[PDB]
Design an enzyme around this catalytic site. Structure first.
Site, PDB file in Angstrom:
ATOM      1  N   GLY A   1       0.803  -1.202   0.000  1.00 27.90           N
ATOM      2  CA  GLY A   1       0.000   0.000   0.000  1.00 27.90           C
ATOM      3  C   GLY A   1       0.842   1.260   0.000  1.00 27.90           C
ATOM      4  O   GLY A   1       2.055   1.248   0.213  1.00 27.90           O
ATOM      5  N   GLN A   2       0.166   2.384  -0.249  1.00 26.51           N
ATOM      6  CA  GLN A   2       0.856   3.669  -0.271  1.00 26.51           C
ATOM      7  C   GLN A   2       1.446   3.999   1.094  1.00 26.51           C
ATOM      8  O   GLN A   2       2.579   4.484   1.188  1.00 26.51           O
ATOM      9  CB  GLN A   2      -0.103   4.769  -0.721  1.00 26.51           C
ATOM     10  CG  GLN A   2       0.520   6.151  -0.751  1.00 26.51           C
ATOM     11  CD  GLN A   2      -0.348   7.166  -1.460  1.00 26.51           C
ATOM     12  OE1 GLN A   2      -1.521   6.914  -1.735  1.00 26.51           O
ATOM     13  NE2 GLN A   2       0.225   8.322  -1.767  1.00 26.51           N
TER      14      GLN A   2
ATOM     15  N   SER B   1      -1.421   0.034   5.962  1.00 23.98           N
ATOM     16  CA  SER B   1      -2.404   0.913   6.577  1.00 23.98           C
ATOM     17  C   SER B   1      -3.656   0.114   6.906  1.00 23.98           C
ATOM     18  O   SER B   1      -4.218  -0.556   6.034  1.00 23.98           O
ATOM     19  CB  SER B   1      -2.754   2.081   5.656  1.00 23.98           C
ATOM     20  OG  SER B   1      -3.970   2.692   6.053  1.00 23.98           O
TER      21      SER B   1
ATOM     22  N   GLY C   1      -7.766   0.338   0.721  1.00 26.17           N
ATOM     23  CA  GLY C   1      -8.043  -0.783  -0.154  1.00 26.17           C
ATOM     24  C   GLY C   1      -6.920  -1.797  -0.203  1.00 26.17           C
ATOM     25  O   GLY C   1      -7.082  -2.937   0.244  1.00 26.17           O
TER      26      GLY C   1
ATOM     27  N   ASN D   1      -2.114   8.367  12.999  1.00 26.90           N
ATOM     28  CA  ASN D   1      -1.573   9.589  12.411  1.00 26.90           C
ATOM     29  C   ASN D   1      -1.843  10.797  13.298  1.00 26.90           C
ATOM     30  O   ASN D   1      -0.988  11.680  13.430  1.00 26.90           O
ATOM     31  CB  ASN D   1      -2.161   9.803  11.016  1.00 26.90           C
ATOM     32  CG  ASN D   1      -1.438   9.005   9.950  1.00 26.90           C
ATOM     33  OD1 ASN D   1      -0.226   8.808  10.020  1.00 26.90           O
ATOM     34  ND2 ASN D   1      -2.182   8.542   8.952  1.00 26.90           N
TER      35      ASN D   1
ATOM     36  N   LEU E   1      13.579 -11.561  17.737  1.00 28.65           N
ATOM     37  CA  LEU E   1      12.281 -11.211  17.170  1.00 28.65           C
ATOM     38  C   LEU E   1      11.156 -12.010  17.818  1.00 28.65           C
ATOM     39  O   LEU E   1      10.071 -11.471  18.068  1.00 28.65           O
ATOM     40  CB  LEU E   1      12.293 -11.440  15.661  1.00 28.65           C
ATOM     41  CG  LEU E   1      11.438 -10.473  14.843  1.00 28.65           C
ATOM     42  CD1 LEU E   1      12.124  -9.120  14.726  1.00 28.65           C
ATOM     43  CD2 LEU E   1      11.139 -11.048  13.469  1.00 28.65           C
TER      44      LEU E   1
ATOM     45  N   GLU F   1      10.954 -13.181  20.809  1.00 33.10           N
ATOM     46  CA  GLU F   1      10.691 -12.862  22.206  1.00 33.10           C
ATOM     47  C   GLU F   1       9.503 -11.922  22.360  1.00 33.10           C
ATOM     48  O   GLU F   1       8.874 -11.907  23.422  1.00 33.10           O
ATOM     49  CB  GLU F   1      11.937 -12.250  22.845  1.00 33.10           C
ATOM     50  CG  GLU F   1      13.170 -13.134  22.748  1.00 33.10           C
ATOM     51  CD  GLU F   1      14.394 -12.508  23.383  1.00 33.10           C
ATOM     52  OE1 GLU F   1      14.236 -11.531  24.144  1.00 33.10           O
ATOM     53  OE2 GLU F   1      15.514 -12.993  23.119  1.00 33.10           O
TER      54      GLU F   1
END
Ligand SMILES: Nc1nc2c(ncn2[C@@H]2O[C@H](COP(=O)(O)OP(=O)(O)OP(=O)(O)O)[C@@H](O)[C@H]2O)c(=O)[nH]1
Ligand SMILES: Nc1nc2c(ncn2[C@@H]2O[C@H](COP(=O)(O)OP(=O)(O)OP(=O)(O)O)[C@@H](O)[C@H]2O)c(=O)[nH]1
Ligand SMILES: Nc1nc2c(ncn2[C@@H]2O[C@H](COP(=O)(O)OP(=O)(O)O)[C@@H](O)[C@H]2O)c(=O)[nH]1
Ligand SMILES: Nc1nc2c(ncn2[C@@H]2O[C@H](COP(=O)(O)OP(=O)(O)O)[C@@H](O)[C@H]2O)c(=O)[nH]1
Ligand SMILES: [Mg+2]
Ligand SMILES: [Mg+2]
Lengths: 430, 431, 430, 431
Positions: B10-11, B132, B136, B198, B244, B246
């Site tokens: 995604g963007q 996100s 979409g 955000n 990772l 843990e």
């Protein structure tokens, strides 16, 4: 000669071992390359205890470094003394344990267990008279608690007669480093409580306290804590490496220290520990050392000894000594602290003296105590264990690795018995 | 410790990725052209037998616009051209399009790259997924990848960074549908998700930072530091390394509760730095204040279930214990009863690096916190309220239905979401 | 050897101690660094009385410096002789007492009481034959009066057999330094009147007078008053440190000086005190010293001895002496001042002579007197106490620290008894 | 002895603060840029790990005008920007606004800073509060802080310096309401208050000093020396150190009588200094004369209850006792019967420093007196008379009521004030 093989598992075990071998090699005058550059001939008299002599005077320590992930062991290679260990003894996996006892004991570590035994057996055969094994690890971690106990059970099945010591870092009471420590500790103790002959419980909280007040160190790092742990580790094996007036090998300590087989959890101590500011103002004599070692402020375990009683105590001195002073001071502690020892043992102190002191010190002592106060440590872990397991706080990770919930209750019940047994002997005949 | 694979979808994810990879290159010293003008950069990079290092990432989008910028950007030489997978038509903010119609066409191409990336790894810790929550492609296609990855790579860590819809700010009208639908399809497959809003980061840029004109180049650049702290243990040595796996073992007590929120300290401008000591307690106390967390939900409104303080830089372990001890004795800060031990400490030696032209000051000492708090339930509830408020009248269901999706899926999604809200209620109460 | 451990509490106690150790160290020829650079071998003969010998000839005084706020003790570190004390003996708090006895005795000092005992016990054990403790403080202050009495009660409970001296600065009659002195003094005396064996009352007003006229010092600072107090403090313990024809340790003084247990408050004195202008015009002989010590103008207490009678008197001489002169002069004072001694004690003077004189003097003497005139001092404090407590002038500060008003009346009643007891013995059989 | 925290509220307090902090920096030698071109400046300053020292103060005002000057003034670099808290709209000389409406909005921001300031202190002696007794912000907001501080920091010293309304000079019409209302809300919480009147200091500037054109830069600069004398014991060593808590233990016999007045000697111009010895008796005798006290109330009209002579400089303890002894034998100077001992001596070695461009001469010997005298009751009575003279007709009550305050509060305030007047009567008489 009497010989020992060292095993270090996990990040905690490996990093303690790295500092431990720096101390051991320094005492025997070994160059980081493995060459011998010492001054006293007495260093090589028992160098066979820890080092296998290779061609060209290059002494190789017979240590087995185990870690399910290359990370920690990789730094050891690049460390100051990395080039002393044999490359083949670095048995490192790829998928590190996720701080869960199940993965390090059943799924991942079980695949690496066979490889480790191959290295250990070669070392054991290299010895002429093997005495026992040493394991350094942490009870709160995944690999150490998991792989360490898996190793202990396997080697015990293969060396029942020999001894196995376990210098285990134990979870601290106030501040923890891992969320799921209670599960790992309870399960790990269930294995140690029946497979190992002696344990040296250490906690970072006590070591932080020692540096803060007993040593006035403003910025203590694990480069500092591991030295105190190593110093105690070296003291326990001094009689094997060097002569003395009254010696005590690993077996001698265990027989004297352990009244009953399941009560083999100890709490170590060291002396003298003095800051450079206070070094000038203190006299270095046997009476001063005795007070500090029995001081609750110097114990390497969080549990306060004064809250309980001592079943057996061992003080291993080093350096030039006076036997009369040692006996007098031990007599003073025996009488002055009348209520700190269980009566049903008429005398609780087992003494040992070695001629050589450590590093630049002219005199030192290592304290070992089989106090019943350690029941408090196991009591807290069980309380935390029941708090989580009551509603399966993090149990799906352990059950997904093949463990069954019935094991957790078995470990809980076994752990509860240990506290009950400890409480029984805290009573007196009259 | 070996490779962790990053998938940017995604963007939002891609724009976060370029910020993250810009950060990764500077830390290890890889120039913008992929040349390495030592042994730890192999976790996120592959050495192309020539001194050129290729990032171990797969950038996927259904629109060429965002990935076209990367192809023409300064890091054009860095990425393997085949990794930059792009579609023809965007998902148009429709979950159904991103999952069923247009997603199904390009899913296979992505999995082909992932398999080739995975094969060249001696050890594969897991996958990082940047996306996100509302959108979409970032929500519909990630669900496909999560389902596809799970079947092929069962029991391997699948971390994800998600832009949760802000409670007050919103940039799309159908986010509640998109966000709830993706939650349903990722709850069973994902291991844990790091949530960021955000609006929350906008607030930090104004109060903590002195930037009055923040942009997504600022949010993403700041968000990049979060991932760097999380993966520093893999890429650098230090006391109390935190692998990772843990995270999932410590921060996820129950399988369905794996949504820790993000927090980072210090975040101070260059001018304001001169007037602060920034000792371990100073930075540590900031992580537990409402004013600094990167999700607008108020932590004080709930209780914690686990925390992982990923300390970094010139830090002393003793101070960490003392600072943590002070936190636990606070009455205002509450930890759930059934978790006597909540903290998962982690310390690393490599200090955070300074991105030239950035709004963040040079700090020789930083801390990043990942916390699983029941207060996040206040964020799901608003999403649930915003969903049935529209679904009762079928506000936009026709768009989703026409793309090969059934109306019943909407009912199932909310029902699963409703149970998740109940779960947080159950865990938050003790006798 | 006979040994003493020094305790100094509060600003007054610490600053007096600092000057006291400068005098003591100078006599024994100790360098400020702690090294010994004396000329006579007789200095080390009894250096064990005050100093613990450390490695390298560095003698460390066994003094415990207590202050609830770091301020005063911080200056001692930077002083000329700061680097002689052991760092660990500096038991300093953070929240200083607000010049109220309650805070220094119940709330704040009670938290620091345990820490101080740890240091004291180590010192007491370091001794081979401990004689007694010394406390320097002020009765008008908060920490000194509060912490000092709290220490006295605790150590008394732990060392009932041993002696404890208390060099206490007492409020002056005319000019005071603190508004709430009457409350602190009355409460403090209630503790001292039953827990300490001997007290050396000193007041700044008398010391100011001595400098003004007896020494012609234009600008006297506490660097001057504390020297006179130290000089008397050194004189009392000279027999322990050095030999003589007729010796008197701390116990010997107490037994002779104290007829009844509650009448153990004394008033000290020193001789010779001569200005440099008048030094040339005066001969230094035993007869001259005797007149000055018994002169009311030289007493270190405001109370005029002529207003009362002497129960017991002790004069400790130092330096080369003639025993016949000492006896003749004491005989003269006994007869000439016929009415200044209570008849029911046939002889009131206890003499002691030491071979070594102090500093550069060739002859010196220290005066100790258990006069009944000191009843006047307690009378004034009670009058001031009742003036304030009659309407609770400043009682809310004390009641807010946990004290009860019933304690104030108990202290008042106990204080009133002491005056009545003193007045009873001022009468004569016939 | 460790930190004491200074809170400067209102235009009066802030303008006094900059005079005080200008004085603090010169004494310790801290340049105007915060750099220290040794161990005792930690009471009022924090070392920012770089050789830059930040004052331990919180400057609060409801109008940006006064704090804006500091931000743009020479000491802009000195203060932590977050400490300089400022509001949007002034209190408009209204107590109700400063307490209820506009005060409530900014109170939390202040407490957030105070807590952070307090946490970095090993020991916290107490708080200094600089404010104007008459005024909107300086009297309404300080009451809020006193209430807020008391609950959080019970039994910690809370000293305050207050500009009491002058008996004759006044610069606002509603001061009697503002002054009485704040007294009611601070009597129970404050420990003791040092009172100063603008008219009294104006008189000193004309008679003692030769300045015919004094300004607030002169009053505040002179008032700054008062605080320096009070806190010198904390910041410097000397015989008879007087800690912060000794003031409340000595100068406050009863909880409700804690309003000592201020006096300072010597105060002489440079030219007039050449013709005076300025010995200890010379300066000491000045403190007890009506012509030098900084409150226009006549001390001779009443009796003293306690005094604290904070001597400073090249002074000898013997002379202090002799000078004090002479004072006590005066028949004109009267001390209340129930307090046989009234003086609380305090001596310090550091002499007062000379502020360049100031109107005060260089003196190697100075004395500052804090005295609790019943004559101050003549100041409360005038305030009480000025209150009911307006409240009977409701002169300005509508402004206060409209801001969320009840009329009954006015009645309670005077009733509490009336009792305070009675208390001074009771303590001033003995059988
Ligand atoms: N923090 C941050 N959020 C972003 C950024 N770009 C997009 N977003 C968020 O993404 C949300 C909408 O989903 P997008 O990611 O933009 O859309 P998408 O992932 O491309 O999926 P499509 O619907 O097919 O366009 C917005 O509400 C933004 O908050 C970014 O660069 N930084
Ligand atoms: N000594 C002195 N007094 C001042 C100074 N500035 C203001 N004042 C006094 O403050 C009184 C009025 O209250 P202010 O402090 O000015 O008003 P405020 O504190 O800003 O509160 P507001 O009503 O909101 O403006 C006046 O009568 C002045 O006497 C100053 O710099 N020095
Ligand atoms: N004393 C000491 N303890 C350590 C050190 N490193 C890690 N630990 C402890 O090890 C615990 C974590 O378990 P760890 O051994 O790292 O996990 P493992 O790698 O799976 O065995 C933490 O609670 C730390 O307290 C060290 O250098 N010294
Ligand atoms: N002789 C003498 N008396 C002192 C000295 N310093 C303080 N004092 C006395 O100590 C009294 C104050 O009590 P103080 O001990 O300072 O309070 P504390 O710190 O709480 O114990 C004053 O009345 C002084 O007379 C000193 O150096 N010499
Ligand atoms: Mg798109
Ligand atoms: Mg204003």
């Amino acid at each position: 000669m009497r010989e020992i093989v060292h095993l270090q598992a996990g990040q905690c075990g490996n990093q303690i071992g790295a500092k431990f071998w720096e101390v051991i090699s320094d005492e025997h005058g070994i160059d980081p390359t493995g060459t011998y550059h010492g001054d006293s001939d007495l260093q090589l008299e028992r160098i066979n205890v820890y080092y296998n002599e290779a061609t060209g005077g290059k002494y190789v320590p017979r240590a087995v470094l185990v870690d399910l992930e290359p990370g920690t062991m990789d730094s050891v290679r690049s460390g100051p003394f990395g080039q002393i260990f044999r490359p083949d003894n670095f048995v490192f996996g790829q998928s590190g344990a996720g701080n869960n006892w199940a993965k390090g004991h059943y799924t991942e570590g079980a695949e690496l267990v066979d490889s480790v035994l191959d290295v250990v057996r070669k070392e054991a055969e290299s010895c002429d008279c093997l005495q026992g094994f040493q394991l350094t690890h942490s009870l709160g971690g995944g690999t150490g608690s998991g792989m360490g106990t898996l190793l202990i059970s396997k080697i015990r099945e293969e060396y029942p007669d020999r001894i196995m010591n376990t210098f285990s870092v134990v979870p601290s009471p106030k501040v923890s480093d891992t969320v799921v420590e209670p599960y790992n500790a309870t399960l790990s103790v269930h294995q140690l409580v029946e497979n190992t002959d002696e344990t040296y419980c250490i906690d970072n909280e006590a070591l932080y306290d020692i540096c803060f007040r007993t040593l006035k160190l403003t910025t203590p790092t694990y480069g500092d804590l591991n030295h105190l742990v190593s110093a105690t580790m070296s003291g326990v094996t001094t009689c094997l490496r060097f002569p003395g007036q009254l010696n005590a090998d690993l077996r001698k300590l265990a027989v004297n220290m352990v009244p009953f087989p399941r009560l083999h959890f100890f709490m170590p101590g060291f002396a003298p520990l003095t800051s450079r500011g206070s070094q000038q103002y203190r006299a270095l004599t046997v009476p001063e050392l005795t007070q500090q070692m029995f001081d609750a402020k110097n114990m390497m375990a969080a549990c306060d000894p004064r809250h309980g009683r001592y079943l057996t105590v061992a003080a291993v001195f080093r350096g030039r000594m006076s036997m009369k002073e040692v006996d007098e001071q031990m007599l003073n502690v025996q009488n002055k602290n009348s209520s700190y020892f269980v009566e049903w043992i008429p005398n609780n102190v087992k003494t040992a003296v070695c001629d050589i002191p450590p590093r630049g010190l002219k005199m030192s002592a290592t304290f070992i105590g089989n106090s019943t106060a350690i029941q408090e440590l196991f009591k807290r872990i069980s309380e935390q264990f029941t708090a989580m397991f009551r509603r399966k706080a993090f149990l799906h990770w352990y059950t997904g690795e093949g463990m069954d919930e019935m094991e957790f209750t078995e470990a809980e019940s076994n752990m509860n018995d240990l506290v009950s047994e400890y409480q029984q002997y805290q009573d007196a005949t009259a | 410790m070996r490779e962790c694979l990053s998938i940017h979808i995604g963007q939002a994810g891609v724009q976060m990725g370029n910020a993250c990879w810009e950060l990764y290159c500077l830390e290890h010293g890889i120039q913008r052209d992929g040349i390495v003008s030592d042994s730890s950069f192999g976790t996120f990079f592959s050495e192309t037998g020539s001194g050129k290092h290729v990032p171990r990432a797969v950038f996927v989008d259904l629109e060429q616009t965002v990935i076209g910028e990367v192809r023409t950007g300064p890091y054009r030489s860095l990425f393997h051209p085949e990794q930059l997978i792009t579609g023809k038509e965007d998902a148009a903010n429709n979950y159904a399009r991103g999952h069923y119609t247009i997603g199904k066409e390009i899913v296979d191409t992505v999995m082909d790259r992932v398999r080739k990336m995975a094969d060249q790894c001696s050890g594969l810790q897991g996958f990082l997924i940047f996306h996100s929550f509302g959108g979409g492609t970032g929500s519909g296609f990630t669900s496909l990848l999560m389902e596809r990855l799970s079947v092929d790579y069962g029991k391997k860590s699948k971390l994800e960074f998600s832009v949760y819809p802000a409670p007050q700010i919103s940039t799309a009208v159908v986010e509640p549908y998109n966000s709830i639908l993706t939650t349903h399809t990722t709850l069973e497959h994902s291991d844990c998700a790091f949530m960021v809003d955000n609006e929350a980061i906008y607030d930090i840029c104004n109060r903590n930072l002195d930037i009055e004109r923040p942009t997504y180049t600022n949010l993403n650049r700041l968000i990049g530091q979060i991932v760097s702290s999380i993966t520093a243990s893999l890429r650098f040595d230090g006391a109390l390394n935190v692998d990772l796996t843990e995270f999932q073992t410590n921060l996820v007590p129950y399988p369905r509760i794996h949504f820790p929120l993000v927090t980072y300290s210090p975040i101070i401008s260059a001018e304001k730095a001169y007037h602060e000591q920034l000792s371990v307690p100073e930075i540590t106390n900031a992580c537990f204040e409402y004013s600094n967390q990167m999700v607008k939900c108020d932590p004080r409104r709930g209780k914690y279930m686990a925390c992982c303080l990923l300390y970094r830089g010139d830090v002393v372990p003793k101070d960490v214990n003392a600072a943590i001890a002070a936190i636990k004795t606070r009455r205002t800060i509450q930890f759930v009863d059934w978790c006597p031990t909540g903290f998962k400490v982690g310390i690393n030696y490599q200090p955070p690096t300074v991105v030239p032209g950035g709004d963040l000051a040079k700090v020789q000492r930083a801390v990043c916190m990942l916390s699983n708090t029941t207060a996040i339930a206040e964020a799901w509830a608003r999403l649930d309220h915003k969903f049935d408020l529209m679904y009762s009248k079928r506000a936009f269901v026709h768009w989703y239905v026409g793309e090969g999706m059934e109306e019943g899926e909407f009912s199932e999604a909310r029902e699963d979401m409703a149970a998740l809200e109940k779960d947080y209620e159950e865990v938050g109460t003790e006798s």
